Design an enzyme around this catalytic site. Structure first.
Site, PDB file in Angstrom:
ATOM      1  N   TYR A  14      -1.779  -1.891   7.143  1.00  0.00           N
ATOM      2  CA  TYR A  14      -1.988  -3.053   6.292  1.00  0.00           C
ATOM      3  C   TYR A  14      -2.253  -4.353   7.091  1.00  0.00           C
ATOM      4  CZ  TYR A  14      -0.752  -6.490   2.639  1.00  0.00           C
ATOM      5  OH  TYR A  14      -0.787  -7.494   1.693  1.00  0.00           O
ATOM      6  N   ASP A  38       2.189 -11.494  -5.861  1.00  0.00           N
ATOM      7  CA  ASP A  38       2.057 -12.278  -4.643  1.00  0.00           C
ATOM      8  C   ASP A  38       1.513 -13.658  -5.055  1.00  0.00           C
ATOM      9  OD1 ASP A  38       1.153 -13.432  -2.275  1.00  0.00           O
ATOM     10  OD2 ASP A  38       0.234 -11.574  -1.477  1.00  0.00           O
TER      11      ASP A  38
END
Ligand SMILES: C[C@]12CCc3c(ccc4cc(O)ccc34)[C@@H]1CCC2=O
EC number: 5.3.3.1
Lengths: 124, 124
Positions: A14, A38
Site C-alpha cells: 500500500y 478517511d
C-alpha cells in the site's frame, strides 16, 4: 485467520503503491465490497468504484509516503503510523495519520479507517 | 463533539497513571459502560468491574509506558503509538502497541482497543 506476515506485506505494498502513483495496485488490495473512511468521522466510500475514485483523487499531486514505525498486526487487523508529504502552490504539507485495516478470509482489506486531525497536519 | 485537545490530554493522563501505578486514575477516565479489548481479537471486557480488574491485573508488575509519537485525534476518537516495558525475575519485556480510544459526549472513554501481536513484543 490472516497471517501477520501477509497483513504487514499488504501495508508495505500500500505504501509503495502510493509512492509510485500505482492506482491499480492500491485498488487491488481491497475486497469488492470494502469501505474507506478517511478521515475518521467523514462519510464512508464503499465499493470498488467509489474507492478507486477516492484514490485517483488522492493521487492528483505527487506523494512521498513513509512508514514511520513497525506495523501492528493481530487477528484479522493491522494498524500503522506513517506520513504523507506533498507540495501545492509552493506550500509543503506533511500529514501523519494512523491507519487501521481489517482483512477478510481471502486476505483483502474490507475496511480502512484513517485517523488524524488538524493537529497531525504539519509544514514541510 | 470532543475537542482533540481533551482527547490528547486523556491519552497523556492514561499513560501517566499507568506509570504511577494509579489504578483509580486510569479507571476514572472510562465511562461506566466502557469496553476494553486487549489484545484485539480477544473477548472485550465490559463495565467498571471488568475494566478495573483488567487494569489491576496489568498493574501486578511496575510498567514503564511512553508515547512514541504525537497522538492522533479526530471526531470522537484518538489513536496512539507507544511502548510499555516491564520486568519479572530479571526478564525484561518491551511491547509496542497502537491503541485506539473512542470517547462519549461526556468526554469519557467508552471503548479502548490495543492492537499488537507477538512481532511487536520483545523479551530478553
Ligand atoms: C494493556 C496495555 C497495552 C498492552 C500491554 C500493557 C501492559 C502489559 C502488557 C503485556 C503484554 O505481554 C502485552 C501487552 C501489554 C498495557 C497496560 C495498559 C495498556 O494499554
Amino acid at each position: 485467520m490472516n497471517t501477520p506476515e501477509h497483513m504487514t506485506a499488504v501495508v508495505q505494498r500500500y505504501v509503495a503503491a502510493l509512492n509510485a502513483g500505482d492506482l491499480d495496485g492500491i485498488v487491488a488490495l481491497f475486497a469488492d465490497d470494502a469501505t474507506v473512511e478517511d478521515p475518521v468521522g467523514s462519510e464512508p466510500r464503499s465499493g470498488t468504484a467509489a474507492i478507486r475514485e477516492f484514490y485517483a483523487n488522492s493521487l492528483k499531486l505527487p506523494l512521498a509516503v513513509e512508514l514511520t514505525q513497525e506495523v501492528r498486526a493481530v487477528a484479522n487487523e493491522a494498524a500503522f503510523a506513517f506520513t504523507v508529504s506533498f507540495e501545492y502552490q509552493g506550500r509543503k504539507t506533511v500529514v501523519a495519520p494512523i491507519n487501521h485495516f481489517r482483512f477478510n478470509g481471502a486476505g483483502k482489506v474490507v475496511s480502512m479507517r484513517a485517523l488524524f486531525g488538524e493537529k497531525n497536519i504539519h509544514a514541510g
